[PDB]
Design a binder for this molecule. Structure first.
Ligand SMILES: NCCc1c[nH]c2ccc(O)cc12
Length: 384
């Protein structure tokens, strides 16, 4: 009964993303009110991803020395403290500290859970099958975070969403203490193929680069689209929110379908087609004149990104099993880093380029870069 571990990682990802998307609208308003009663806000937004990026390799090295369960339970304890600090703290320094601890706990959870999933489901097809479901938790959390936070802030109070999240985190921790049972410290068997040797591999580099560019696309699209919308179409407030919902729905559908469908078609071909489709959709985005023109390209973007992730997350596993020692916590530490890249320099770099040249040229450059990198996935094909 290893489905409990899958449920644990699914819940961890879901709750992490729920907190991430719940905290996003509340912080700018009351922070500005307290200042009354650009650089710092960008620093606050990027601190979580920066700290996660910095602490990924250390978790990758520590899971080899002590194992997965102790790092996972620490992810529950840091995320519980971050959720209670977010609920009770109202100053800038305490906010920065909470967002940074959230980053540390999210690094622990992501790296250790992906390593444990890869080590428990050692079959090649089942690995992708379960990683698709686990990646679906991110989409579910992003989808259900904003409405949950909005209603709970609307009716009960400001601290109510955070207290409810804390109760759910406690339930998750109780389940973890029942099944995971992190009582003693157990070392792993063999060595870990140090990061310096793994970073010289061109195939791992190609997979990581594909993930990084595919995610940086949406990471720079998401905060730069409403600014263009309000100036071109003069859209209303709710239309700014409902326009990016097709991306979140299509990501869920595409992940859950292609986690199973990528093995039969070919992981390299699925990644190549995902790159081509996301590039074409980003290129067609600037031509839209009203919300209905934007519905379809967003669906294409989400579908393609789901394809790419659900094909390239299980391959990072297959490449170390094939060319290195079968220890996963340090290779997934690389993969997670790719994600953090998109979340670290995404919004800031996207803003400056858009002010300097314009938004259609930014989208054209993203699309051209994705289209040109797509042939590189041809080298990822299995030799037989
Ligand atoms: N790595 C998946 C990122 C992603 C895919 N679809 C999304 C929709 C909204 C969002 O904030 C993020 C995403």
């Amino acid at each position: 009964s290893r489905k409990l571990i899958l449920f644990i990682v699914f819940l961890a990802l879901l709750l992490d993303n729920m907190l991430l998307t719940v905290v996003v609208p509340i912080i700018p308003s009351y922070l500005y009110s307290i200042k009354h009663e650009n650089v710092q806000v960008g620093l606050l937004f990027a601190s979580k991803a920066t700290v996660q990026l910095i602490t990924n390799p250390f978790i990758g090295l520590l899971t080899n020395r002590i194992g997965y369960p102790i790092p996972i339970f620490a992810g529950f304890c840091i995320m519980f403290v971050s959720t209670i600090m977010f609920a009770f703290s109202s100053s800038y320094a305490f906010l920065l500290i909470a967002r940074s601890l959230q980053g540390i706990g999210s690094s622990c959870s992501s790296v250790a859970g992906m390593g444990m999933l890869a080590s428990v489901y050692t079959d090649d097809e089942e690995r992708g099958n379960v990683m698709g479901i686990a990646l679906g938790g991110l989409a579910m959390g992003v989808l259900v975070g904003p409405p949950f936070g909005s209603v709970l802030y609307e009716f009960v109070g400001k601290t109510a969403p955070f207290l409810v999240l804390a109760a759910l985190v406690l339930l998750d921790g109780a389940i973890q203490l029942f099944v995971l049972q992190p009582s003693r410290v157990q070392p792993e068997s063999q060595k870990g193929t140090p990061l310096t040797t793994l970073l010289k591999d061109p195939y791992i580099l190609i997979a990581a680069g594909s993930i990084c560019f595919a995610n940086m696309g949406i990471a720079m699209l998401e905060p730069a689209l409403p600014i263009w919308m309000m100036e071109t179409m003069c859209s209303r407030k709710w239309q700014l929110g409902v326009a990016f919902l097709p991306a979140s729905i299509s990501y869920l559908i595409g992940t859950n379908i292609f986690g199973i469908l990528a093995h039969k078609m070919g992981r390299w071909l699925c990644a190549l087609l995902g790159m081509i489709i996301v590039g074409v959709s980003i290129l067609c985005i600037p031509f839209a004149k009203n919300i209905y023109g934007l519905i379809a390209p967003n669906f294409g973007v989400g579908f393609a990104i789901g394809m790419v992730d659900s094909s390239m997350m299980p391959i990072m596993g297959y490449l170390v099993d094939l060319r290195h020692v079968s220890v996963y916590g340090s290779v997934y530490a690389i993969a997670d880093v790719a994600f953090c890249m998109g979340y670290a320099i995404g919004p800031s770099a996207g803003g400056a380029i858009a002010k300097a040249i314009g938004f259609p040229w930014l989208m054209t450059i993203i699309g051209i870069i994705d289209i040109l990198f797509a042939p590189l996935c041809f080298f990822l094909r299995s030799p037989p």
